[PDB]
């Protein structure tokens, strides 16, 4: 066996403890991935750090499932019911915001997103996140940093990020 195992890329050492990753099927020194031999006994399926990292990054790129869509609706609704969401519920009315459409080239609001969710417009979570981010970026671009509108965007985006944790 001339294969270089683990993240450290070294030949197999029969005297050292290794744990196998069920995702990539490579073998890792327990110490290099933070797993103790006694600890391995209590582990069922094992996924190494690099594979876990890839899976985490993958979440926003994979196809949205019907279960994912039920989740998107849940997230949207929690945002719509949030106290700081009132400025983003519907498209901005020109009469309420001077030259808004002359400043904002790509408007977005929660009602438009709800419609997109309804017609399954999003194919990846990254697209949903992009529209939501657009709402907050548009607000912070149009409104001054000391206006409550700007602050509502800061609050809601922080709330949104937490809401998305462990989504898929």
């Amino acid at each position: 066996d001339t294969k270089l195992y683990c993240i450290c890329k070294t030949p197999y050492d029969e005297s050292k403890f290794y744990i196998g990753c069920d995702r990539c099927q490579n073998w890792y020194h327990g110490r290099c991935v933070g797993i103790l031999q006694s600890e391995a006994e209590l582990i069922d399926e094992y996924v190494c750090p690099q594979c876990q990292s890839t899976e985490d990054a993958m979440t926003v790129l994979t196809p949205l499932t019907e279960k994912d869509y039920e989740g998107l609706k849940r997230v949207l609704r929690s945002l719509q019911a949030h106290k700081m969401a009132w400025p983003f519920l519907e498209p901005v009315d020109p009469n309420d915001a001077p030259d808004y459409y002359g400043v904002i080239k790509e408007p977005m609001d929660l009602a438009t997103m709800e419609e997109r969710v309804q017609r399954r417009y999003y194919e990846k979570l990254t697209e949903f996140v992009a529209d939501m981010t657009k709402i907050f970026d548009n607000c912070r671009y149009y409104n001054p940093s000391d206006s409550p509108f700007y602050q509502c965007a800061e609050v809601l985006e922080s709330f949104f990020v937490q809401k998305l944790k462990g989504f898929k």
């Binding site: 005297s15 290794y18 744990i19 196998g20 391995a40 094992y46």
Partner: peptide, 6 residues
């Protein structure tokens, strides 16, 4: 979990 021991 699958492992290799000394």
């Amino acid at each position: 979990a699958r492992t290799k021991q000394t």
